Design a protein around this ligand. Structure first.
Ligand SMILES: [Cl-]
Ligand SMILES: [Cl-]
Ligand SMILES: [Cl-]
Ligand SMILES: [Cl-]
Length: 279
């Protein structure tokens, strides 16, 4: 892989490899996402979950949320990739976390970037100002947060107000992705991924981790792609048999558009190459 990377870099053919992925990517129907009644549940009209892999909400109301289950069979990991919640879908977002039994939420954007809103403020910033989602009957309380220079980990308490059951949700927030482009070095991003892993949030004991950025396909795709490739490299007898392009095309059977630019593709390669050396 590190030779294929150096050759793609020497040849300058990241854009070509990336356009090949786009051309080969699966196309499945997104009928439900495009229903008129779901217009205000989609942050971007061009980014929709496929019907076959969308997450369905369970309460007696519209079951639609812009979220997809990515189930990587060989790597034996699942992820939920979703858009940054909208002001009217934060209750649905936490309903999904509850119903899918997720332990961790991975956020790869700041709520505002370059002075534009990428995502609703869907968790409480102050302990004493908890959030109640009256539509889905959930309460969300900030218990503590561990703010580091490049990411923050928050301990949130999510309470189902119907049953009074509570769960601890870990919010892993990568706060330093650049305004433009991708990180120059994958070190921070890998350290962040390894902290999510260390938490147990990605274990099969829990529901799938919920990963989002603004549309839930670009930075989020890099996170899940890197994580899955690194899993495959540990499992296979020949770890250089792991073909990142093939893994990405497999992930794109579950959600469209994962990895949004040739720079993100190169970054994913770089993260996998560097992450494998660490492990
Ligand atoms: Cl933020
Ligand atoms: Cl792991
Ligand atoms: Cl492969
Ligand atoms: Cl695309």
């Amino acid at each position: 892989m590190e030779k294929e990377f150096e050759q793609i870099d020497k040849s300058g053919s990241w854009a070509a490899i990336y356009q090949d992925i786009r051309h080969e990517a699966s196309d499945f129907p997104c009928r439900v996402a495009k229903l008129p009644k779901n217009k205000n549940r989609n942050r971007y009209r061009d980014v929709s979950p496929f019907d076959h892999s969308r997450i369905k909400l369970h309460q007696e109301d519209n079951d639609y949320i812009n979220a997809s289950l990515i189930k990587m069979e060989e790597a034996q990991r699942s992820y939920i990739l979703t858009q940054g919640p909208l002001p009217n879908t934060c209750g649905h977002f936490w309903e999904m976390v509850w119903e899918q039994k997720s332990r961790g939420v991975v956020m790869l954007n700041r709520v505002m970037e370059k002075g534009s809103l990428k995502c609703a403020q869907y968790w409480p910033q102050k302990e004493e100002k908890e959030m109640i989602f009256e539509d889905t009957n959930l309460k969300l309380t900030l218990i503590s947060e561990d703010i580091k220079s490049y990411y923050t980990v928050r301990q949130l308490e999510l309470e189902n107000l119907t049953t009074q059951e509570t769960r601890e949700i870990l919010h892993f927030h990568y706060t330093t992705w650049p305004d433009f482009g991708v990180p120059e070095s994958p070190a921070s991003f890998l350290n962040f991924l390894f902290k999510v892993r260390e938490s147990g949030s990605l274990s099969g004991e829990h529901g799938p981790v919920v990963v989002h950025c603004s549309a839930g396909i670009g930075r989020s795709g890099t996170f899940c792609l890197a994580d899955t490739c690194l899993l495959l490299m540990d499992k296979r007898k020949d770890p250089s048999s792991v073909d990142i392009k093939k893994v990405l095309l497999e992930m794109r059977k579950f959600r469209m558009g994962l990895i949004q630019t040739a720079d993100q593709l190169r970054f994913s390669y770089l993260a996998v190459i560097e992450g494998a050396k660490f492990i």
